[PDB]
Design a protein around this ligand. Structure first.
Ligand SMILES: O=c1oc2ccc(F)c(F)c2cc1CO[C@H]1[C@@H](O)[C@@H](CO)O[C@@H](S[C@@H]2O[C@H](CO)[C@H](O)[C@H](n3cc(-c4cccc(F)c4)nn3)[C@H]2O)[C@@H]1O
Length: 138
């Protein structure tokens, strides 16, 4: 059990082989979730499930640089369900973040922000009950 929004420090930033695990439960009438891997004010990797964007469910990924969002990458595979417990795993790989939900691969997101060891915070926000947020090296 954790207060949302939650900030998880990533000491010394991220590195290939680092695995971030987020456990929570989606609220009953959810509208959105967001993970924000941040490099200061920049968002290296924004992972944003939207439950009702024109009555469709979509995952939006993006990067924010100098307060400007870039080109979205969109995924229609949508593994989250209002009311249900989930596990998000984000594995840092050399060329991308690799995301699996509930043990099934979901998407990868190529590194736009190159200075991995400056991506030193993860913000977790939105319509969830947050159970845990942690990391380990595999
Ligand atoms: O940081 C926050 O904190 C919160 C706290 C609370 C809370 F309630 C919140 F909602 C928040 C939200 C954010 C950040 O949120 C922002 C981030 O998610 C950001 C990521 O890109 O998106 C913006 S939205 C964006 O506005 C844009 C123009 O401005 C466009 O409209 C664009 N877009 C692309 C497409 C599209 C359609 C068809 C095909 C196709 F290929 C693409 N259709 N629309 C559209 O996505 C959003 O606002």
């Amino acid at each position: 059990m954790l207060i949302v929004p939650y900030n998880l420090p990533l000491p010394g930033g991220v590195v290939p082989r680092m695995l971030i695990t987020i456990l929570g439960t989606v609220k009953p009438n959810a509208n959105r979730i967001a993970l924000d891997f941040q490099r200061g004010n920049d968002v290296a990797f924004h992972f944003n499930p939207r439950f009702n964007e024109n009555n469709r469910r979509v995952i939006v990924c993006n990067t924010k640089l100098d307060n400007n969002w870039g080109r979205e990458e969109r995924q229609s595979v949508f593994p989250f369900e209002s009311g249900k417990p989930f596990k998000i795993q984000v594995l840092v790989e050399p060329d991308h973040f690799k995301v699996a939900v509930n043990d099934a691969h979901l998407l990868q997101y190529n590194h736009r922000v190159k200075k991995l060891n400056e991506i030193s915070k993860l913000g977790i926000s939105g319509d969830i009950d947050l159970t845990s947020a942690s990391y380990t090296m595999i």
